[PDB]
mmCIF file of C-alpha atoms and ligand atoms in Angstrom:
data_model
loop_
_atom_site.group_PDB
_atom_site.id
_atom_site.type_symbol
_atom_site.label_atom_id
_atom_site.label_comp_id
_atom_site.label_asym_id
_atom_site.label_seq_id
_atom_site.Cartn_x
_atom_site.Cartn_y
_atom_site.Cartn_z
ATOM 1 C CA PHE A 13 17.581 2.396 15.625
ATOM 2 C CA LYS A 14 16.440 3.320 19.216
ATOM 3 C CA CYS A 15 12.636 5.001 20.355
ATOM 4 C CA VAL A 16 13.327 8.626 20.602
ATOM 5 C CA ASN A 17 9.557 9.643 20.669
ATOM 6 C CA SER A 18 5.630 8.701 21.002
ATOM 7 C CA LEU A 19 2.605 10.128 21.315
ATOM 8 C CA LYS A 20 -1.552 9.446 20.969
ATOM 9 C CA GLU A 21 -4.383 10.608 18.574
ATOM 10 C CA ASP A 22 -7.027 12.233 20.613
ATOM 11 C CA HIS A 23 -9.779 10.239 18.834
ATOM 12 C CA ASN A 24 -8.696 6.174 20.908
ATOM 13 C CA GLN A 25 -9.395 4.386 17.418
ATOM 14 C CA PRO A 26 -7.093 2.059 15.759
ATOM 15 C CA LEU A 27 -4.579 3.884 13.416
ATOM 16 C CA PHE A 28 -4.763 1.956 10.335
ATOM 17 C CA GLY A 29 -2.067 3.417 8.064
ATOM 18 C CA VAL A 30 0.785 5.528 8.135
ATOM 19 C CA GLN A 31 2.662 7.134 4.955
ATOM 20 C CA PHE A 32 5.903 8.992 4.854
ATOM 21 C CA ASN A 33 5.792 11.415 2.158
ATOM 22 C CA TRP A 34 8.601 10.458 -0.137
ATOM 23 C CA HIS A 35 7.975 13.065 -2.329
ATOM 24 C CA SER A 36 8.622 15.877 0.317
ATOM 25 C CA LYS A 37 11.014 18.876 -1.072
ATOM 26 C CA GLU A 38 14.998 19.510 -0.393
ATOM 27 C CA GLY A 39 15.354 21.305 2.637
ATOM 28 C CA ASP A 40 11.931 20.469 4.250
ATOM 29 C CA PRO A 41 11.114 18.274 7.299
ATOM 30 C CA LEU A 42 10.419 14.944 6.836
ATOM 31 C CA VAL A 43 6.404 14.570 7.138
ATOM 32 C CA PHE A 44 4.104 11.450 7.211
ATOM 33 C CA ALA A 45 0.514 10.738 7.489
ATOM 34 C CA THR A 46 -1.624 8.733 9.569
ATOM 35 C CA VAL A 47 -5.129 7.328 9.094
ATOM 36 C CA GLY A 48 -7.732 6.271 11.781
ATOM 37 C CA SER A 49 -11.139 6.838 12.888
ATOM 38 C CA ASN A 50 -12.399 9.459 10.472
ATOM 39 C CA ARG A 51 -9.445 11.630 10.230
ATOM 40 C CA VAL A 52 -5.978 12.108 8.506
ATOM 41 C CA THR A 53 -3.214 13.688 10.208
ATOM 42 C CA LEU A 54 -0.144 15.169 9.196
ATOM 43 C CA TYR A 55 3.412 15.368 11.450
ATOM 44 C CA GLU A 56 6.654 16.774 10.892
ATOM 45 C CA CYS A 57 10.016 14.848 12.265
ATOM 46 C CA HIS A 58 12.618 16.987 13.678
ATOM 47 C CA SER A 59 15.620 17.221 15.860
ATOM 48 C CA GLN A 60 15.320 15.767 19.361
ATOM 49 C CA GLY A 61 12.604 13.138 18.336
ATOM 50 C CA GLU A 62 10.452 15.783 18.460
ATOM 51 C CA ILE A 63 6.966 15.262 16.152
ATOM 52 C CA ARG A 64 5.172 17.944 15.254
ATOM 53 C CA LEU A 65 1.310 18.111 14.572
ATOM 54 C CA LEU A 66 0.425 20.296 11.929
ATOM 55 C CA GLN A 67 -3.424 19.511 10.844
ATOM 56 C CA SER A 68 -5.567 17.150 10.153
ATOM 57 C CA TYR A 69 -8.832 16.553 7.701
ATOM 58 C CA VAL A 70 -11.635 15.263 9.226
ATOM 59 C CA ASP A 71 -14.441 13.612 7.246
ATOM 60 C CA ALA A 72 -18.417 15.121 7.579
ATOM 61 C CA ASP A 73 -19.394 11.591 8.274
ATOM 62 C CA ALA A 74 -18.720 10.192 11.788
ATOM 63 C CA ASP A 75 -19.219 6.973 10.514
ATOM 64 C CA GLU A 76 -16.534 6.957 7.801
ATOM 65 C CA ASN A 77 -13.353 5.084 9.030
ATOM 66 C CA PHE A 78 -10.169 5.245 6.966
ATOM 67 C CA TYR A 79 -8.070 2.512 6.134
ATOM 68 C CA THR A 80 -5.523 3.547 4.027
ATOM 69 C CA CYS A 81 -3.750 6.506 2.498
ATOM 70 C CA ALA A 82 -1.161 7.164 -0.093
ATOM 71 C CA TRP A 83 1.215 10.178 -1.768
ATOM 72 C CA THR A 84 1.248 11.497 -5.176
ATOM 73 C CA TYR A 85 2.154 15.470 -6.702
ATOM 74 C CA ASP A 86 0.026 17.213 -8.972
ATOM 75 C CA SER A 87 1.600 16.519 -12.249
ATOM 76 C CA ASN A 88 1.500 20.224 -13.619
ATOM 77 C CA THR A 89 2.579 21.928 -10.254
ATOM 78 C CA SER A 90 4.312 19.664 -8.480
ATOM 79 C CA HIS A 91 2.510 20.296 -5.097
ATOM 80 C CA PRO A 92 2.041 17.160 -3.189
ATOM 81 C CA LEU A 93 -1.264 15.588 -2.805
ATOM 82 C CA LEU A 94 -2.570 12.706 -0.589
ATOM 83 C CA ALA A 95 -5.355 10.002 -1.276
ATOM 84 C CA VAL A 96 -7.585 8.550 1.398
ATOM 85 C CA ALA A 97 -10.114 5.861 1.567
ATOM 86 C CA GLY A 98 -11.752 3.516 3.802
ATOM 87 C CA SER A 99 -15.311 1.892 4.797
ATOM 88 C CA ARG A 100 -17.581 4.265 2.819
ATOM 89 C CA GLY A 101 -15.565 3.339 -0.546
ATOM 90 C CA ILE A 102 -15.028 6.758 -1.208
ATOM 91 C CA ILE A 103 -11.315 8.137 -2.555
ATOM 92 C CA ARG A 104 -10.643 11.498 -1.421
ATOM 93 C CA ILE A 105 -7.688 13.456 -3.221
ATOM 94 C CA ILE A 106 -6.300 15.885 -0.083
ATOM 95 C CA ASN A 107 -4.428 18.895 -0.547
ATOM 96 C CA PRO A 108 -1.907 18.453 2.200
ATOM 97 C CA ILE A 109 -1.094 21.815 2.913
ATOM 98 C CA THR A 110 -4.521 22.808 3.465
ATOM 99 C CA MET A 111 -6.242 19.745 4.246
ATOM 100 C CA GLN A 112 -8.736 20.752 1.795
ATOM 101 C CA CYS A 113 -10.864 18.008 -0.147
ATOM 102 C CA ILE A 114 -9.842 18.706 -3.540
ATOM 103 C CA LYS A 115 -12.343 16.038 -5.315
ATOM 104 C CA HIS A 116 -13.354 12.765 -4.659
ATOM 105 C CA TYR A 117 -14.001 9.458 -6.578
ATOM 106 C CA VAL A 118 -16.543 6.531 -5.734
ATOM 107 C CA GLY A 119 -16.546 3.435 -7.576
ATOM 108 C CA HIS A 120 -19.518 0.952 -6.344
ATOM 109 C CA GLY A 121 -19.215 2.626 -2.807
ATOM 110 C CA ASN A 122 -17.771 -0.323 -0.907
ATOM 111 C CA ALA A 123 -14.716 -0.683 1.344
ATOM 112 C CA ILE A 124 -11.553 0.151 0.134
ATOM 113 C CA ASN A 125 -8.752 -1.317 1.961
ATOM 114 C CA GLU A 126 -5.872 -0.308 0.356
ATOM 115 C CA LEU A 127 -4.326 2.537 -1.870
ATOM 116 C CA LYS A 128 -1.290 2.616 -4.633
ATOM 117 C CA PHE A 129 -0.130 5.080 -6.826
ATOM 118 C CA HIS A 130 1.851 3.971 -9.876
ATOM 119 C CA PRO A 131 5.495 4.245 -9.381
ATOM 120 C CA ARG A 132 6.085 6.207 -12.757
ATOM 121 C CA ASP A 133 3.007 8.021 -13.035
ATOM 122 C CA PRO A 134 1.426 10.585 -10.367
ATOM 123 C CA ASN A 135 -1.878 10.101 -12.350
ATOM 124 C CA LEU A 136 -2.619 6.549 -11.773
ATOM 125 C CA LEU A 137 -4.165 5.037 -8.599
ATOM 126 C CA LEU A 138 -4.918 1.990 -7.807
ATOM 127 C CA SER A 139 -8.059 1.220 -5.008
ATOM 128 C CA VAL A 140 -8.594 -2.583 -3.953
ATOM 129 C CA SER A 141 -11.988 -3.361 -2.062
ATOM 130 C CA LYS A 142 -14.160 -5.092 -0.102
ATOM 131 C CA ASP A 143 -16.415 -5.828 -3.502
ATOM 132 C CA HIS A 144 -13.736 -8.100 -4.342
ATOM 133 C CA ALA A 145 -12.304 -5.807 -7.431
ATOM 134 C CA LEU A 146 -9.517 -3.596 -8.132
ATOM 135 C CA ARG A 147 -10.319 -0.335 -9.912
ATOM 136 C CA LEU A 148 -7.132 1.844 -11.788
ATOM 137 C CA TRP A 149 -7.916 5.376 -11.768
ATOM 138 C CA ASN A 150 -6.483 8.683 -13.800
ATOM 139 C CA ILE A 151 -7.069 11.503 -11.189
ATOM 140 C CA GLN A 152 -5.910 13.847 -14.121
ATOM 141 C CA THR A 153 -8.565 13.338 -16.512
ATOM 142 C CA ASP A 154 -11.051 11.919 -13.127
ATOM 143 C CA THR A 155 -11.632 8.560 -14.999
ATOM 144 C CA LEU A 156 -11.774 5.166 -14.453
ATOM 145 C CA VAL A 157 -9.695 3.305 -16.239
ATOM 146 C CA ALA A 158 -10.228 -0.260 -15.569
ATOM 147 C CA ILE A 159 -11.941 -2.503 -13.280
ATOM 148 C CA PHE A 160 -10.177 -6.007 -12.360
ATOM 149 C CA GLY A 161 -12.873 -8.637 -11.332
ATOM 150 C CA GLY A 162 -14.690 -11.359 -12.896
ATOM 151 C CA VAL A 163 -15.202 -14.656 -11.532
ATOM 152 C CA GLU A 164 -11.776 -15.587 -12.383
ATOM 153 C CA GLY A 165 -10.794 -12.619 -10.530
ATOM 154 C CA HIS A 166 -10.952 -12.492 -6.857
ATOM 155 C CA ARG A 167 -13.379 -14.223 -4.779
ATOM 156 C CA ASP A 168 -13.883 -12.218 -1.718
ATOM 157 C CA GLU A 169 -12.109 -8.978 -0.046
ATOM 158 C CA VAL A 170 -8.951 -7.709 -1.925
ATOM 159 C CA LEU A 171 -6.709 -6.661 0.807
ATOM 160 C CA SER A 172 -3.526 -5.283 -0.707
ATOM 161 C CA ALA A 173 -1.948 -4.850 -3.953
ATOM 162 C CA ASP A 174 1.790 -3.602 -5.665
ATOM 163 C CA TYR A 175 2.655 -2.516 -8.814
ATOM 164 C CA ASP A 176 6.333 -3.780 -9.737
ATOM 165 C CA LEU A 177 9.148 -1.417 -10.191
ATOM 166 C CA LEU A 178 8.199 -0.015 -13.799
ATOM 167 C CA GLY A 179 4.404 -0.257 -13.262
ATOM 168 C CA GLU A 180 3.929 -2.829 -15.952
ATOM 169 C CA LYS A 181 2.227 -5.243 -13.719
ATOM 170 C CA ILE A 182 0.110 -5.897 -10.594
ATOM 171 C CA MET A 183 -0.270 -8.552 -7.837
ATOM 172 C CA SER A 184 -3.027 -8.425 -5.627
ATOM 173 C CA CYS A 185 -4.427 -10.876 -2.524
ATOM 174 C CA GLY A 186 -6.673 -11.038 -0.536
ATOM 175 C CA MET A 187 -9.367 -13.420 1.855
ATOM 176 C CA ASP A 188 -9.612 -15.897 -0.460
ATOM 177 C CA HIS A 189 -5.920 -17.040 0.125
ATOM 178 C CA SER A 190 -4.768 -16.248 -3.392
ATOM 179 C CA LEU A 191 -2.339 -13.706 -4.910
ATOM 180 C CA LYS A 192 -3.413 -12.697 -8.968
ATOM 181 C CA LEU A 193 -1.036 -10.925 -11.489
ATOM 182 C CA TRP A 194 -2.504 -8.822 -13.807
ATOM 183 C CA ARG A 195 -0.425 -6.964 -16.490
ATOM 184 C CA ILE A 196 -0.916 -3.639 -17.109
ATOM 185 C CA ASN A 197 1.335 -3.257 -19.936
ATOM 186 C CA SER A 198 -0.909 -5.343 -22.193
ATOM 187 C CA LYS A 199 -1.781 -3.271 -25.861
ATOM 188 C CA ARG A 200 -5.324 -3.600 -24.480
ATOM 189 C CA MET A 201 -4.464 -1.596 -20.982
ATOM 190 C CA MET A 202 -1.636 0.569 -22.687
ATOM 191 C CA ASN A 203 -4.592 1.863 -25.151
ATOM 192 C CA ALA A 204 -7.088 2.325 -22.222
ATOM 193 C CA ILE A 205 -4.323 4.451 -20.255
ATOM 194 C CA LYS A 206 -3.457 6.383 -23.564
ATOM 195 C CA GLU A 207 -7.502 7.181 -24.045
ATOM 196 C CA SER A 208 -7.848 7.984 -20.327
ATOM 197 C CA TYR A 209 -5.681 10.922 -21.070
ATOM 198 C CA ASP A 210 -7.333 12.143 -24.111
ATOM 199 C CA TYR A 211 -10.591 12.326 -22.575
ATOM 200 C CA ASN A 212 -12.337 15.386 -21.375
ATOM 201 C CA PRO A 213 -15.932 15.294 -21.124
ATOM 202 C CA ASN A 214 -16.072 19.125 -21.847
ATOM 203 C CA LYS A 215 -15.043 18.204 -25.483
ATOM 204 C CA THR A 216 -17.286 15.146 -26.473
ATOM 205 C CA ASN A 217 -20.393 12.950 -26.234
ATOM 206 C CA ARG A 218 -19.194 10.000 -24.941
ATOM 207 C CA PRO A 219 -18.907 8.770 -21.358
ATOM 208 C CA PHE A 220 -15.524 7.281 -20.694
ATOM 209 C CA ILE A 221 -15.532 3.397 -21.416
ATOM 210 C CA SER A 222 -13.408 1.594 -18.509
ATOM 211 C CA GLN A 223 -11.787 -2.086 -19.562
ATOM 212 C CA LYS A 224 -13.268 -4.683 -17.562
ATOM 213 C CA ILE A 225 -10.213 -7.119 -16.806
ATOM 214 C CA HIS A 226 -11.648 -10.715 -15.902
ATOM 215 C CA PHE A 227 -8.402 -12.532 -16.506
ATOM 216 C CA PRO A 228 -5.369 -12.515 -14.122
ATOM 217 C CA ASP A 229 -2.463 -13.334 -16.056
ATOM 218 C CA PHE A 230 -1.260 -15.685 -13.187
ATOM 219 C CA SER A 231 -3.171 -17.124 -9.875
ATOM 220 C CA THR A 232 -1.773 -18.711 -7.044
ATOM 221 C CA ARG A 233 -3.206 -20.238 -3.839
ATOM 222 C CA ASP A 234 -0.643 -22.384 -2.607
ATOM 223 C CA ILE A 235 1.771 -19.800 -0.901
ATOM 224 C CA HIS A 236 -0.566 -19.252 2.352
ATOM 225 C CA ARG A 237 -3.427 -20.627 3.890
ATOM 226 C CA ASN A 238 -5.118 -17.499 5.035
ATOM 227 C CA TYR A 239 -6.391 -14.181 4.491
ATOM 228 C CA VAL A 240 -3.352 -12.731 2.251
ATOM 229 C CA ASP A 241 -3.134 -9.359 3.818
ATOM 230 C CA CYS A 242 0.006 -7.592 2.631
ATOM 231 C CA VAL A 243 2.098 -8.008 -0.876
ATOM 232 C CA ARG A 244 5.130 -6.282 -2.375
ATOM 233 C CA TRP A 245 7.035 -6.722 -5.451
ATOM 234 C CA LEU A 246 11.088 -7.145 -4.814
ATOM 235 C CA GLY A 247 12.307 -7.257 -8.052
ATOM 236 C CA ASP A 248 10.657 -9.620 -9.982
ATOM 237 C CA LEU A 249 10.164 -11.712 -6.875
ATOM 238 C CA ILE A 250 7.068 -11.685 -4.504
ATOM 239 C CA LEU A 251 7.047 -10.959 -0.512
ATOM 240 C CA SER A 252 3.569 -12.076 0.803
ATOM 241 C CA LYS A 253 2.238 -12.390 4.101
ATOM 242 C CA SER A 254 -0.704 -14.082 5.917
ATOM 243 C CA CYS A 255 -1.707 -14.590 9.642
ATOM 244 C CA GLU A 256 0.917 -17.635 10.091
ATOM 245 C CA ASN A 257 3.540 -15.712 11.670
ATOM 246 C CA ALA A 258 5.816 -15.365 8.186
ATOM 247 C CA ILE A 259 6.545 -13.071 5.177
ATOM 248 C CA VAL A 260 6.789 -15.465 2.222
ATOM 249 C CA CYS A 261 9.505 -14.458 -0.753
ATOM 250 C CA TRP A 262 8.219 -16.472 -4.310
ATOM 251 C CA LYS A 263 7.855 -16.418 -7.704
ATOM 252 C CA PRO A 264 5.412 -17.746 -10.165
ATOM 253 C CA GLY A 265 6.471 -20.585 -11.972
ATOM 254 C CA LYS A 266 9.927 -22.532 -11.727
ATOM 255 C CA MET A 267 13.030 -20.951 -10.334
ATOM 256 C CA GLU A 268 14.798 -20.394 -13.904
ATOM 257 C CA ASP A 269 11.533 -18.995 -15.462
ATOM 258 C CA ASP A 270 11.140 -15.535 -16.198
ATOM 259 C CA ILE A 271 8.240 -13.466 -15.066
ATOM 260 C CA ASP A 272 7.353 -12.189 -18.230
ATOM 261 C CA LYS A 273 6.861 -15.834 -19.921
ATOM 262 C CA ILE A 274 4.912 -16.825 -17.231
ATOM 263 C CA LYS A 275 1.481 -18.076 -18.794
ATOM 264 C CA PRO A 276 -2.086 -17.522 -16.962
ATOM 265 C CA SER A 277 -2.711 -21.378 -16.467
ATOM 266 C CA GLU A 278 1.120 -21.506 -14.758
ATOM 267 C CA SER A 279 0.523 -24.325 -11.981
ATOM 268 C CA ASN A 280 4.172 -24.114 -10.267
ATOM 269 C CA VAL A 281 5.481 -21.506 -7.438
ATOM 270 C CA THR A 282 9.208 -21.249 -6.301
ATOM 271 C CA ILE A 283 9.526 -20.623 -2.860
ATOM 272 C CA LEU A 284 13.107 -18.312 -2.080
ATOM 273 C CA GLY A 285 12.568 -18.081 1.836
ATOM 274 C CA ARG A 286 10.678 -17.186 4.582
ATOM 275 C CA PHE A 287 10.977 -14.916 7.130
ATOM 276 C CA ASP A 288 9.836 -15.853 10.224
ATOM 277 C CA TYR A 289 8.513 -13.833 13.592
ATOM 278 C CA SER A 290 6.248 -14.137 16.257
ATOM 279 C CA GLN A 291 2.347 -12.800 17.813
ATOM 280 C CA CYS A 292 1.500 -11.812 14.496
ATOM 281 C CA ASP A 293 -1.565 -13.970 13.905
ATOM 282 C CA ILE A 294 -3.972 -11.325 13.976
ATOM 283 C CA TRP A 295 -5.791 -10.578 10.368
ATOM 284 C CA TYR A 296 -4.949 -6.949 9.080
ATOM 285 C CA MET A 297 -1.347 -6.153 9.689
ATOM 286 C CA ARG A 298 1.292 -4.770 6.733
ATOM 287 C CA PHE A 299 4.898 -4.885 6.293
ATOM 288 C CA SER A 300 6.514 -1.935 4.737
ATOM 289 C CA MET A 301 9.803 -1.440 2.691
ATOM 290 C CA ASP A 302 12.117 2.053 2.608
ATOM 291 C CA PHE A 303 12.287 3.759 -1.030
ATOM 292 C CA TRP A 304 15.165 1.698 -2.146
ATOM 293 C CA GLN A 305 13.994 -1.418 -1.163
ATOM 294 C CA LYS A 306 17.108 -2.020 1.293
ATOM 295 C CA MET A 307 14.731 -2.598 4.852
ATOM 296 C CA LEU A 308 11.797 -4.162 5.404
ATOM 297 C CA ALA A 309 9.275 -4.009 8.967
ATOM 298 C CA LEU A 310 6.847 -5.085 10.043
ATOM 299 C CA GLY A 311 5.227 -4.847 13.853
ATOM 300 C CA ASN A 312 3.328 -7.720 15.709
ATOM 301 C CA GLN A 313 0.083 -7.926 17.912
ATOM 302 C CA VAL A 314 1.830 -6.978 21.122
ATOM 303 C CA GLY A 315 4.225 -3.935 19.984
ATOM 304 C CA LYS A 316 7.267 -5.328 18.822
ATOM 305 C CA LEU A 317 9.068 -4.414 15.492
ATOM 306 C CA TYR A 318 10.395 -6.476 13.364
ATOM 307 C CA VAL A 319 13.144 -5.148 10.901
ATOM 308 C CA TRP A 320 14.968 -6.753 7.769
ATOM 309 C CA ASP A 321 18.301 -5.820 5.985
ATOM 310 C CA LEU A 322 17.579 -7.041 2.435
ATOM 311 C CA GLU A 323 21.001 -5.749 0.992
ATOM 312 C CA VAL A 324 22.318 -9.497 0.667
ATOM 313 C CA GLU A 325 22.954 -12.005 -1.955
ATOM 314 C CA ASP A 326 19.775 -14.159 -2.062
ATOM 315 C CA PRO A 327 16.389 -13.378 -0.061
ATOM 316 C CA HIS A 328 16.888 -16.122 2.262
ATOM 317 C CA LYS A 329 19.697 -14.631 3.484
ATOM 318 C CA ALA A 330 18.022 -11.343 5.355
ATOM 319 C CA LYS A 331 19.450 -10.180 8.473
ATOM 320 C CA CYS A 332 16.462 -9.385 11.402
ATOM 321 C CA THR A 333 16.677 -6.940 14.021
ATOM 322 C CA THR A 334 14.055 -6.442 16.755
ATOM 323 C CA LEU A 335 12.673 -3.502 18.389
ATOM 324 C CA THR A 336 11.193 -2.724 21.433
ATOM 325 C CA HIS A 337 9.943 -0.576 24.062
ATOM 326 C CA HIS A 338 8.150 -1.875 27.436
ATOM 327 C CA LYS A 339 5.443 0.951 26.595
ATOM 328 C CA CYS A 340 4.428 0.217 23.343
ATOM 329 C CA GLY A 341 2.151 -2.906 23.893
ATOM 330 C CA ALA A 342 -0.520 -2.737 21.065
ATOM 331 C CA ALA A 343 -0.769 -4.033 17.663
ATOM 332 C CA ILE A 344 1.431 -2.273 15.292
ATOM 333 C CA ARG A 345 -1.061 -2.344 12.003
ATOM 334 C CA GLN A 346 1.609 -0.512 9.755
ATOM 335 C CA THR A 347 4.769 1.331 9.599
ATOM 336 C CA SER A 348 6.764 3.649 7.128
ATOM 337 C CA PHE A 349 10.514 4.371 6.634
ATOM 338 C CA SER A 350 11.291 7.855 5.747
ATOM 339 C CA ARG A 351 12.934 7.728 2.561
ATOM 340 C CA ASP A 352 16.555 7.323 3.441
ATOM 341 C CA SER A 353 15.479 5.286 6.145
ATOM 342 C CA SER A 354 16.775 7.291 8.936
ATOM 343 C CA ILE A 355 13.379 7.071 10.463
ATOM 344 C CA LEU A 356 10.705 4.329 11.050
ATOM 345 C CA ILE A 357 7.588 5.173 12.260
ATOM 346 C CA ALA A 358 5.053 2.729 13.697
ATOM 347 C CA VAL A 359 1.127 3.424 14.400
ATOM 348 C CA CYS A 360 -0.830 1.002 16.844
ATOM 349 C CA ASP A 361 -4.518 0.347 17.530
ATOM 350 C CA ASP A 362 -4.749 2.164 20.932
ATOM 351 C CA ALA A 363 -4.138 5.446 18.325
ATOM 352 C CA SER A 364 -0.383 5.452 19.345
ATOM 353 C CA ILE A 365 2.455 6.548 17.185
ATOM 354 C CA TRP A 366 6.587 5.712 17.842
ATOM 355 C CA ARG A 367 9.146 7.178 16.192
ATOM 356 C CA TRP A 368 12.802 5.021 16.032
ATOM 357 C CA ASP A 369 15.828 6.918 14.890
ATOM 358 C CA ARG A 370 18.759 5.164 12.912
ATOM 359 C CA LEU A 371 21.532 4.914 15.223
HETATM 360 C C1 LIG B 401 -10.960 -6.259 5.716
HETATM 361 N N1 LIG B 401 -11.531 -5.430 6.844
HETATM 362 C C2 LIG B 401 -12.560 -5.760 7.609
HETATM 363 C C3 LIG B 401 -10.324 -4.740 7.244
HETATM 364 C C4 LIG B 401 -9.087 -4.370 6.623
HETATM 365 N N2 LIG B 401 -8.494 -3.338 7.030
HETATM 366 C C5 LIG B 401 -7.455 -2.513 6.394
HETATM 367 C C6 LIG B 401 -6.360 -1.538 7.296
HETATM 368 C C7 LIG B 401 -5.446 -2.359 8.150
HETATM 369 C C8 LIG B 401 -5.414 -3.349 6.992
HETATM 370 C C9 LIG B 401 -3.935 -4.399 6.879
HETATM 371 C C10 LIG B 401 -3.848 -5.292 5.648
HETATM 372 C C11 LIG B 401 -4.898 -5.463 5.155
HETATM 373 C C12 LIG B 401 -5.945 -4.395 5.379
HETATM 374 F F1 LIG B 401 -7.181 -4.649 4.079
HETATM 375 C C13 LIG B 401 -6.327 -3.534 6.121
HETATM 376 C C14 LIG B 401 -9.600 -2.471 7.280
HETATM 377 C C15 LIG B 401 -10.742 -3.500 8.115
HETATM 378 C C16 LIG B 401 -10.652 -3.571 9.580
HETATM 379 C C17 LIG B 401 -11.731 -3.430 10.516
HETATM 380 C C18 LIG B 401 -11.535 -3.166 11.792
HETATM 381 C C19 LIG B 401 -10.506 -3.753 12.488
HETATM 382 N N3 LIG B 401 -10.341 -3.705 13.771
HETATM 383 C C20 LIG B 401 -9.259 -3.318 14.229
HETATM 384 C C21 LIG B 401 -8.699 -3.856 15.374
HETATM 385 N N4 LIG B 401 -9.861 -3.328 16.523
HETATM 386 S S1 LIG B 401 -9.463 -2.809 18.195
HETATM 387 C C22 LIG B 401 -8.467 -1.952 18.179
HETATM 388 O O1 LIG B 401 -9.842 -4.175 19.174
HETATM 389 O O2 LIG B 401 -10.892 -1.982 18.739
HETATM 390 C C23 LIG B 401 -11.399 -3.788 16.109
HETATM 391 C C24 LIG B 401 -11.448 -3.373 14.950
HETATM 392 C C25 LIG B 401 -9.419 -4.188 11.802
HETATM 393 C C26 LIG B 401 -9.634 -3.977 10.160
#
């Protein structure tokens, strides 16, 4: 990769999130969103490294701090949608064409640290919160499907979560040092999702009942020894990080144990590898993968990017390269690959945005 451009947003506050729109249409330029301060901004990538500024949504509350965003599309029209959330605990669904807010969701109103859309269902939105819970929403019927919590759930802020390939299960992580698995292909959760689609408050008297899921299907505190701030599935394996200068590749159970036969009492984990790096020992730094899961990127606290090629026979064989620029010195909170991995964008604590193009 080579650095082709950079810019700084006028608010001078940390950029906490960046996401390419992997649903952008054939023959349209590549578009990414950034979140920081109380705003979300869209940019288009053009030739000669140009990053073209489009339009922002600015929250009416000056004390809102957006922490996360996620792209989906309208399941009836195919038009793109953007979900954003942060410190106020309000999920906003934004029309990215006009940047109008279309609607919003409040849970209990505590900070939301990450949003993720289900990989097969564009209406199913997962939020993770400072209140120790995850929430699954159906943004077609405007229903809260389920809350994942209880004393056997997380015991401090939830910082990240990820759906597996088919969206049959979720792995979550946070400040309690634990990683927890939640199956959403149980008969109970499949029924709840079905009921959420059948719910129309204009045609019934009942409120929609949300499931309370109080028991994860697996839990470990044996991977990391500090806050776990990012997690992603790699097939049936997990990649996760803390602030110990490492991304760990691991799985529940013993080497030969099938993920779908793991019982909630499983006490073992298997470590398949670990990707070390330097100067990323502050809390709240995310890694990202490309659409095909061929590539992994992480930025560190002094502006260096690490990129791993995962197109190798076993996880521990991943090939690392590093990307530095003499003017890029601030902490990189998140990266995003374009769908094809031709562009990598990094965003920073000084409101700076860095574009790297594949050679
Ligand atoms: C748990 N809460 C408190 C965090 C979570 N984090 C989110 C968004 C980024 C990220 C990455 C991984 C996991 C996450 F949950 C999150 C949002 C919250 C937060 C608040 C303030 C800051 N600081 C930035 C750096 N500066 S500065 C540039 O020195 O002014 C001082 C504020 C850092 C993070």
